[PDB]
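can u pls check wat happens w/ HO2
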Amino acid sequence: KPLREIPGSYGIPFFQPIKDRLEYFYGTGGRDEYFRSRMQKYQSTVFRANMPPGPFVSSNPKVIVLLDAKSFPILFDVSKVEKKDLFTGTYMPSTKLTGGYRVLSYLDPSEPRHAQLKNLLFFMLKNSSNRVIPQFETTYTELFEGLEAELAKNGKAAFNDVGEQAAFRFLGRAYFNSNPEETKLGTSAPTLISSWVLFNLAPTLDLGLPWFLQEPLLHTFRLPAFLIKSTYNKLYDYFQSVATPVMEQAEKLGVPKDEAVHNILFAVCFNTFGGVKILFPNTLKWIGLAGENLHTQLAEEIRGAIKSYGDGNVTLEAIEQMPLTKSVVYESLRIEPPVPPQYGKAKSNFTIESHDATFEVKKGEMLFGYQPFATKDPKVFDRPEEYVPDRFVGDGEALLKYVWWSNGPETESPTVENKQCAGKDFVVLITRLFVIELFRRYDSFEIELGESPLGAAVTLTFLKRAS
Ligand code: HEM
Ligand SMILES: CCCCC[C@H](O)/C=C/C=C/CCCCCCCC(=O)O
């Protein structure tokens, strides 16, 4: 693997970043093609490139693209890449959209508040790791139920919207033993959250709207924060009066209540919610398309393990007796990473390598990985583009080191020293509980997709039951 100069150009300083941007957003093939075609052009899985949002919202579009499993890892190595204000990318949503504070996600582990706010989050999870399983069944048994009636009523039932309401219902319930739909928020949190997240991510979001609408309105400037302000407080009011326990630990940690509430609100609405809004529909999708031997076996495993080890109910012991169910949730996480882009700014002059070359990285350069590609490396995973349910079963467990949806080997856990998903163990559980509940009710199901910028736009059409 010879030392080579990283291929790719940045072109003229203003025109290029804009032109590429348009390519990234409207070129036939989507952003996936933006990378694949460059991978092909330079016969390299590591190359130079501009990345949105470019122009006025971003002052530095220049990055180095990582597309292979060999190089991609450097991004986890916090000893070499910095993780300051790049949670999104080459731009950071105005702080006005987050209480004036720079929330946890944007902090480098070398920042005291990082370890502080992360522990605060570790408390919120642990301190609620007892309502998770109970409160989950309760919320999705509301959901499937609600979906069952809507099905027989008109033939089909959309999953996405309802699923999000349940998601936020389940989060409040567990994290704070609260049903938000019993407060002023009503069943209208998913909308508040979207409206708010849109303001933040607007510069790098493709809503599938005409380029002559998206470019002027969403991709050249930042949206006036004052507009969202009203909506943001509606969510702020909720968290402030329900996150009491967690709001106290924040003081015990040296963090003010106000700043804490803004970080809690972010973690629950942006991190948690934003992620499940995507992962669940896709997981329900990949399984759905798997056929029936999966369904029949998934329902078989879950129930058997529920009797044998759960005594007639879901428990951590029983889950550990669901090898297929575990692998399934992992595969979903491998085949379609809910949060694709990982960034890292080089702190020193070091070297990295692809499957067939080496490259010099200089202090100050931004490294960018497109995970969906890296986790689909044929040199690592067989029939990569396929969803193999039992891929991580048996000796497959040894590949977990390669599942990076949480910004790090699935075989590792989040710490204050790293930038790995704080709710890592949390999502793996609830995504299993998701699949677990599903088949603990249905012997099988069928579904038809639909396109959307979110991902699946799933609608159910059939639902065999137990008994
Ligand atoms: C399945 C849903 C979720 C997905 C896909 C997801 C994904 C991610 C990713 C990719 C990062 C890395 C960002 C970076 O580049 O620096 C991240 C960070 C983070 N996530 Fe999540 N996440 C999910 C759920 C959650 C939940 C439920 C929590 C709540 C406790 C959470 C808390 C965090 C925190 C606190 C960080 C930053 C930690 C740090 O500063 O080191 N995430 N998440
Ligand atoms: C490439 C951006 C990655 C963001 C990862 C983050 O976890 C996402 C959070 C929420 C995403 C969904 C936000 C709404 C997307 C649809 C457009 C806005 C809306 O109407 O909801």
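Residues 194, 197-198, 201, 204-205, 207, 270, 274-275, 277, 339-341, 453-454 surround HO2 (ligand 2) (CB under 6 Å).
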